[PDB]
Structure 1
Amino acid sequence: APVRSLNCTLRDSQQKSLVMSGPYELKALHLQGQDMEQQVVFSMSFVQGEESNDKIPVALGLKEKNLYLSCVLKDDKPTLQLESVDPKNYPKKKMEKRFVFNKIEINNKLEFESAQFPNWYISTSQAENMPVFLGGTKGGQDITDFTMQFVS
């Protein structure tokens, strides 16, 4: 049948919100009150892939935009990018591997591992207003844990 999707927001474990920062850019910063309208709303699709109780393959598209988070090699490194797709063809159940994240539930938080690049995670910096990126370890100064908020 159709792929199933939910609208949601993400915040990192320091409660930083994610916002659009100009073309194909996402930034993490502390947000509260009126300014929270600026946060990015995701359409999280539940896609084809290897699955276990606490490890669920998803795609992360921007709500009602033909833009998806994806993992590709750039100047020879696993990187996180926003990628344009054909809006007639997405979302779909069989998303290409660069778009797939393993959503992992650990100690009441979520981590998003690249399906393409094992042990690379959606990450934020501790500093304010820095890019969201792919970080090649879930252990150090960089933040790899999130909570999800479900949206109407």
Structure 2
Amino acid sequence: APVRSLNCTLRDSQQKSLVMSGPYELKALHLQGQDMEQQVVWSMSFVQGEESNDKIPVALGLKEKNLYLSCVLKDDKPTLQLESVDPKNYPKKKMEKRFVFNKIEINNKLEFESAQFPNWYISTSQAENMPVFLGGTKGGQDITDFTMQFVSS
């Protein structure tokens, strides 16, 4: 296939799951049992960009929905948002830079660095039910590492 993808779920290192808050927002919270089904299922796409043996560029969209994570400036600050795209033209090998994240593997966890804003990572709060965001400080009060779970597609 042109653009290759794989379906997965993601949890932060504190075992919190991701769920869609509103129409264009994501939140992270400790979910277990039946609630599990609420979590977001992603279609991770391997797109074009500067690739390394530990840094792979990817795009993240919801499975079956024309919604992708995007990094943009909002009120003079790098910001993470869910963005609507034409369902006919996506996904594609050459995604716009704002949709691109560098998937990084350190210990056994994953980190997603914004290709648009270097050293800015997708992060979650230690607190419960807070919005998922773009953070410029790694290894601090906020969480920036995740594990990935494959789904039967």
**What range is the shorter-chain TM-score in?**
over 0.9
Q: Once the 2 structures are TM-superposed, how far is the Cα of residue 139 of structure 1 from its aligned partner?
A: 1.9
In structure 2, how many angstroms separate the alpha carbons of the residues matched to 1:43 and 1:96?
A: 17
In structure 1, how many angstroms separate the alpha carbons of the residues matched to 2:14 and 2:142?
A: 11
Question: What number of residue pairs does the alignment pair up?
Answer: 152
In structure 2, how many angstroms separate the alpha carbons of the residues matched to 1:86 and 1:66?
A: 7
Q: How big is the alpha-carbon RMSD for the aligned residues of Structure 1 and Structure 2? A: 0.7
Give 2:30's aligned residue. 30
Q: Once the 2 structures are TM-superposed, how far is the Cα of residue 21 of structure 1 from its aligned partner?
A: 0.9
SS of equivalent to 1:44 = strand
SS of equivalent to 2:36 = helix
In structure 2, how many angstroms separate the alpha carbons of the residues matched to 1:37 and 1:139?
A: 30
Q: Once the 2 structures are TM-superposed, how far is the Cα of residue 138 of structure 1 from its aligned partner?
A: 1.2
In structure 1, how many angstroms separate the alpha carbons of the residues matched to 2:85 and 2:22?
A: 18
Post-superposition CA distance 1:53-97 (Å, at most 9, x none): 110000000000110001000001000000000000000000000
In structure 2, how many angstroms separate the alpha carbons of the residues matched to 1:147 and 1:97?
A: 24
Q: Once the 2 structures are TM-superposed, how far is the Cα of residue 147 of structure 1 from its aligned partner?
A: 0.2
- TM-score (normalizing by structure 2): 0.98
Runs of 4+ in 1 over 4 A off after TM superposition: none
Post-superposition CA distance 1:10-52 (Å, at most 9, x none): 0000000000112101000001100000000000000000011
Post-superposition CA distance 1:78-132 (Å, at most 9, x none): 0000000000000000000000000000011000000000000000000000000
Give 2:5's aligned residue. 5
Structure 2 residues without counterparts, runs of 5 or longer: none
Give 2:119's aligned residue. 119
In structure 2, how many angstroms separate the alpha carbons of the residues matched to 1:11 and 1:107?
A: 15
Q: Once the 2 structures are TM-superposed, how far is the Cα of residue 137 of structure 1 from its aligned partner?
A: 1.6
Structure 1 residues without counterparts, runs of 5 or longer: none
In structure 2, how many angstroms separate the alpha carbons of the residues matched to 1:22 and 1:110?
A: 25
- TM-score (normalizing by structure 1): 0.99
